[PDB]
Write an enzyme that holds these catalytic residues in place. Structure first.
Site, PDB file in Angstrom:
ATOM      1  N   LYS A  87     -12.493  -1.313   7.176  1.00 23.38           N
ATOM      2  CA  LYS A  87     -11.701  -2.200   8.087  1.00 23.38           C
ATOM      3  C   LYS A  87     -12.126  -1.975   9.523  1.00 23.38           C
ATOM      4  O   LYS A  87     -12.514  -2.987  10.133  1.00 23.38           O
ATOM      5  CB  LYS A  87     -10.216  -1.976   7.812  1.00 23.38           C
ATOM      6  CG  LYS A  87      -9.662  -2.666   6.606  1.00 23.38           C
ATOM      7  CD  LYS A  87      -8.927  -1.887   5.511  1.00 23.38           C
ATOM      8  CE  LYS A  87      -8.764  -2.678   4.238  1.00 23.38           C
ATOM      9  NZ  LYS A  87      -7.827  -2.100   3.129  1.00 23.38           N
TER      10      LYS A  87
ATOM     11  N   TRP B 147       0.822  -1.202   0.000  1.00 26.11           N
ATOM     12  CA  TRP B 147       0.000   0.000   0.000  1.00 26.11           C
ATOM     13  C   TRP B 147       0.854   1.249   0.000  1.00 26.11           C
ATOM     14  O   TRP B 147       0.461   2.260  -0.631  1.00 26.11           O
ATOM     15  CB  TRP B 147      -1.016  -0.017   1.177  1.00 26.11           C
ATOM     16  CG  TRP B 147      -2.057  -1.110   0.938  1.00 26.11           C
ATOM     17  CD1 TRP B 147      -2.279  -2.220   1.687  1.00 26.11           C
ATOM     18  CD2 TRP B 147      -2.970  -1.172  -0.163  1.00 26.11           C
ATOM     19  NE1 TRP B 147      -3.282  -2.955   1.141  1.00 26.11           N
ATOM     20  CE2 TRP B 147      -3.735  -2.345   0.004  1.00 26.11           C
ATOM     21  CE3 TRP B 147      -3.258  -0.350  -1.267  1.00 26.11           C
ATOM     22  CZ2 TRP B 147      -4.728  -2.703  -0.897  1.00 26.11           C
ATOM     23  CZ3 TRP B 147      -4.240  -0.706  -2.160  1.00 26.11           C
ATOM     24  CH2 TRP B 147      -4.960  -1.882  -1.951  1.00 26.11           C
TER      25      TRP B 147
ATOM     26  N   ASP C  61      -1.783   7.077   5.732  1.00 29.34           N
ATOM     27  CA  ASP C  61      -2.803   6.122   5.309  1.00 29.34           C
ATOM     28  C   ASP C  61      -2.995   5.164   6.487  1.00 29.34           C
ATOM     29  O   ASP C  61      -2.189   4.260   6.737  1.00 29.34           O
ATOM     30  CB  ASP C  61      -2.333   5.337   4.080  1.00 29.34           C
ATOM     31  CG  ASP C  61      -3.280   4.243   3.635  1.00 29.34           C
ATOM     32  OD1 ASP C  61      -4.359   4.048   4.281  1.00 29.34           O
ATOM     33  OD2 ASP C  61      -2.933   3.581   2.636  1.00 29.34           O
TER      34      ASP C  61
HETATM   35  C1  LIG Z   1      -7.316  -1.672   1.530  1.00 29.80           C
HETATM   36  C2  LIG Z   1      -6.288  -0.605   1.654  1.00 29.80           C
HETATM   37  C3  LIG Z   1      -6.225   0.489   0.774  1.00 29.80           C
HETATM   38  C4  LIG Z   1      -7.099   0.600  -0.441  1.00 29.80           C
HETATM   39  O1  LIG Z   1      -8.431   1.074  -0.020  1.00 29.80           O
HETATM   40  P1  LIG Z   1      -9.613   1.207  -1.139  1.00 29.80           P
HETATM   41  O2  LIG Z   1     -10.738   1.802  -0.308  1.00 29.80           O
HETATM   42  O3  LIG Z   1      -9.848  -0.169  -1.680  1.00 29.80           O
HETATM   43  O4  LIG Z   1      -9.104   2.167  -2.205  1.00 29.80           O
HETATM   44  C5  LIG Z   1      -5.274   1.474   0.983  1.00 29.80           C
HETATM   45  N1  LIG Z   1      -4.427   1.439   2.048  1.00 29.80           N
HETATM   46  C6  LIG Z   1      -4.461   0.388   2.948  1.00 29.80           C
HETATM   47  C7  LIG Z   1      -3.490   0.437   4.068  1.00 29.80           C
HETATM   48  C8  LIG Z   1      -5.384  -0.633   2.779  1.00 29.80           C
HETATM   49  O5  LIG Z   1      -5.433  -1.617   3.648  1.00 29.80           O
HETATM   50 CL   LIG Z   2       0.930  -3.527   2.793  1.00 30.26          CL
HETATM   51 CL   LIG Z   3      -5.078  -5.649   1.731  1.00 30.27          CL
END
Ligand SMILES: *Cc1c(COP(=O)(O)O)cnc(C)c1O
Ligand SMILES: [Cl-]
Ligand SMILES: [Cl-]
Ligand SMILES: *Cc1c(COP(=O)(O)O)cnc(C)c1O
Ligand SMILES: [Cl-]
Ligand SMILES: [Cl-]
Ligand SMILES: [Mg+2]
Ligand SMILES: [Mg+2]
Ligand SMILES: [Mg+2]
Ligand SMILES: [Mg+2]
Lengths: 360, 357
Positions: free
Chosen positions: A196, A102, A172
């Site tokens: 999440k 990510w 993020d």
């Molecule tokens: C799942 C994830 C994303 C992507 O999120 P989307 O809503 O699918 O764009 C980005 N960063 C992390 C850390 C993630 O776990």
């Molecule tokens: Cl990752």
């Molecule tokens: Cl993931």
């Protein structure tokens, strides 16, 4: 009923009370005789939900008064481009700390829009740890320093956050937001897809220091300016009203159970069940992460060979476990243990793991 | 107990069967013991729903195989920029037909990204009609011709669509998609936020001719990303797509696009006949030949009466009738799921209000 244990990595388990509440009032919300899905976003009933979701986040994370909470569409993935579109100006650098896949995806989008840099990285060692903050290579003309707090694919997580003074720190936090207390004032911006720890998919929470991002950026489309959404309180266009309502319901449950401090205690306990099982297995299960970087949210591990991995994952599926296959890019196993995953699912996973080892 | 009539303009009324279905299985979808909201979008359980939504749209609109069906976030408003970002290339023109405020918002975003043009416009007459197609000013180097099929604020609607050969025809169909049969082959691209005729807010449907559709465009903002990944590049709005599926099953069960068009024509007729028989007490904004079947816009003879009528309606359980702020008056939004009995109730209220004036 068949037993089901929901270890899905995203979207993921929700707290049952939030779902039961939504079910009960799905057709008649707040005595309106309409679903929340059927209301105007300018109705009193919807405005109250929108405002409460913000106020609950503010209380739970202790968000200071000079930050605003945005509710945006597009996922965290859209934030990968929206952030540099707004802050990566000519002559500045988007500086990234790489701690998993990510992180790499975020860097990639900034590279399309301006100069980038890698402040620190554990890529060469397959992302087993968070780099020491002493390793970070900073630039006077950094537009920001971007981190990924919880590296969902690799099962590693920041234990604490660096003190950055030369540029805003951006994170993020998709896979660990509101799993523990946070000092929001360390950051210029935090973003997270809801799916999440906060709610269902379709809304992304963005916590922004207002004066960093409240100004027009020449030449950026209206919908892609943070200023548009700050000025309109995330009502510039039609919001994802049901997703924000579910987010509100999840935040009410977090608060009811004792907030961020209480949920951290719960999360540490349920993670320890699984990590202890790994550590007691004499190498039958091997965690990916270095112990000092182990995530409380995503537990990544392998058996001694791919045939055993396959056999374990097949047995887990037979026994009602959902979502344990590792991300397709890395294989192995991944037990996602976000806030709402119940501790008895973790106990059940331990029992499966012990039995599979003993019967191998 | 309380009688409520949902004339909201967006988000809007949904079919009772679709909502009841969602309620019943909210905790336990397809015997998985999880909500649809708790499924991985890379699960077979979610992927089946995603595919079924696409399949039902294809069936119901008779979408040819050489079109792709995308499910995106961001609303129609994000499409206002995403379209020119992908198709408004150097030396080409984004050519717009202006038939209301939503047309203007689309044009505004194209102007930030390249050369634009106004093919035709009824702005000078307050958007009372759709312009005659013979008035369209077209250019050899048009990248596309953009229209707004249903002008949600003004209450006007295209009766049929122009035959455009020189560039692709692109339509913002947010407020009338799947309210009637369509000849999708007339278009290069159709887009619509779901929250009027297709489902709740949070997903946008884009129907695109695959050969229509970019160096330097961000990954999430390329149509190609979503085409190649079947709208699973990142996490989709899973519950919104599930609800879209449920709405489409309701349309199919009622007999499809022709059956829904007959219902919509009957609903609109009740309201327009009430206006037209009112001896001028109610006046529609739209020219009769351009009247929308989706949003009926009208006013009483002065603003005090407008306010009195709207207050009385609110008191009697009608929701959403206030006209858009930019124009005032009244707006009865009568999208697919608004029931005929609500339109009858509005008529009866309109007749009584006039009688008591
Ligand atoms: C799942 C994830 C994303 C992507 O999120 P989307 O809503 O699918 O764009 C980005 N960063 C992390 C850390 C993630 O776990
Ligand atoms: Cl990752
Ligand atoms: Cl993931
Ligand atoms: C409501 C509407 C829009 C804006 O849709 P959002 O999903 O709020 O961005 C665009 N076009 C038309 C014709 C509309 O009715
Ligand atoms: Cl309009
Ligand atoms: Cl509107
Ligand atoms: Mg409470
Ligand atoms: Mg239990
Ligand atoms: Mg008009
Ligand atoms: Mg008649």
């Amino acid at each position: 009923v068949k037993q089901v244990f929901n270890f899905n990595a995203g979207p993921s388990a929700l707290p049952k009370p939030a779902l039961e509440r939504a079910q009960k009032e799905l057709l008649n919300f707040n005595d309106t005789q309409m679903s929340v899905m059927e209301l105007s976003h300018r109705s009193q009933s919807y405005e109250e939900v929108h405002e409460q979701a913000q106020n609950l986040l503010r209380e739970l994370l202790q968000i200071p008064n000079d930050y605003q909470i945005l509710f945006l569409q597009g996922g965290a993935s859209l934030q990968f481009t929206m952030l540099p579109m707004n802050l990566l100006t000519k002559g500045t650098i988007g500086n990234y700390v790489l701690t998993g896949s990510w992180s790499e995806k975020a860097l990639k989008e900034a590279k399309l829009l301006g100069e980038t840099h890698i402040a620190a990285s554990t890529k060469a060692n397959s992302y087993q740890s968070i780099p020491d903050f002493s390793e970070f290579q900073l630039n006077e003309n950094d537009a920001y320093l971007h981190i990924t707090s919880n590296n969902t694919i690799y099962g590693t997580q920041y234990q604490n956050f660096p003190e950055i003074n030369h540029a805003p720190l951006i994170a993020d936090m998709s896979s660990d937001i509101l799993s523990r207390p946070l000092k929001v004032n360390q950051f210029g911006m935090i973003y997270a897809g809801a799916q999440k720890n906060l709610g269902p998919s379709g809304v992304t929470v963005v916590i922004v220091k207002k004066d960093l991002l409240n100004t027009k950026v020449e030449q950026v489309p209206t919908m892609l300016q943070y200023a548009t959404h700050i000025k309109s309180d995330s009502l510039y266009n039609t919001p994802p009203t049901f997703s924000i309502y579910m987010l509100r319901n999840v935040l009410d449950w977090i608060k009811d159970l004792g907030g961020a401090e209480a949920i951290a205690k719960q999360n540490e306990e349920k993670a320890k069940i699984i990590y202890d099982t790994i550590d007691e297995s004499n190498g039958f299960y091997v965690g990916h992460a270095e112990k000092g970087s182990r995530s409380l949210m995503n537990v990544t591990f392998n058996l001694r060979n791919e045939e055993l991995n396959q056999q374990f994952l097949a047995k887990a599926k037979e026994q009602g476990f959902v979502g344990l296959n590792g991300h397709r890019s890395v294989g192995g196993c991944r037990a996602s243990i976000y806030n709402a995953v119940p501790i008895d699912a973790c106990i059940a996973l331990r029992e499966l793991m012990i039995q599979f080892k003993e019967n191998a």
